[PDB]
């Protein structure tokens, strides 16, 4: 579960609040 040199980092939806960019890319 390392994302150095990868193309997509896992951002948890629990931190997205009301940021629409976050919700667009986050993972549960």
């Amino acid at each position: 579960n390392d994302f150095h040199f990868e193309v997509f980092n896992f951002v948890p939806c629990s931190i997205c609040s009301n940021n629409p960019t976050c919700w667009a890319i986050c993972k549960r």
Epitope: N1, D2, F3, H4, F5, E6, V7, F8, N9, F10, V11, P12, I15, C16, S17, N19, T21, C22, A24, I25, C26
Partner: antibody, heavy 124, light 108 residues
Amino acid sequence: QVHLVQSGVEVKKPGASVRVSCKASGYTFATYGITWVRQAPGRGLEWVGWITPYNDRTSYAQIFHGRVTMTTDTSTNTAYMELRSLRSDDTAMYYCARNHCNFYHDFWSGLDYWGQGTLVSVSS
Amino acid sequence: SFELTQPPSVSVSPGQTARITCSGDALPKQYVYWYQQKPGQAPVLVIYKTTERPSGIPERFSDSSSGTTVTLTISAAQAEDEADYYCQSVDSSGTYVFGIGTKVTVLG
């Protein structure tokens, strides 16, 4: 397949401001941060700060507070660093680089891909 | 932020082993990253997460730990290894710290 491409050389007078862009390709821009690092001629690497687009949060080294603004434009997948009130000793190569926060293991990453650098020269 | 201490310069004879240390009281809890910067080029990540070598970096480059000190070892040093080497770490709040950079001269 990841590329960061920066804008060209800037020659500015003292007191002016400069904006440098950093255009990303080859990855999901909104899941990584963009870091800026500065290098004066003959000197070492100086962290400027980072910006994460998924929460618009920024962290700058204290010396740049009030003078630097980082923004990201997720519609053009471009990051920007603006530096205001330029002084001769702001002359430096400015790099953008890709970082991220590993949420599984809760650590901030190294800088794996780098832009080519933008030279900003300040003089009258 | 916590400091990272690396020597300002290291000289190595061609084909011999260079050792560049990076010390900080926070290193037992944080990863170290090493960047190589050759003259006129952007920095390149050569070691990450303290022990990992990206694909494409020569196997001559390795990193070990010992207390609060990390050592980047360049075995059988080649003229093309002459460069500035920066160590780097971060704290848990996201502040990034670079060492001063070590100028490694491959001294013919």
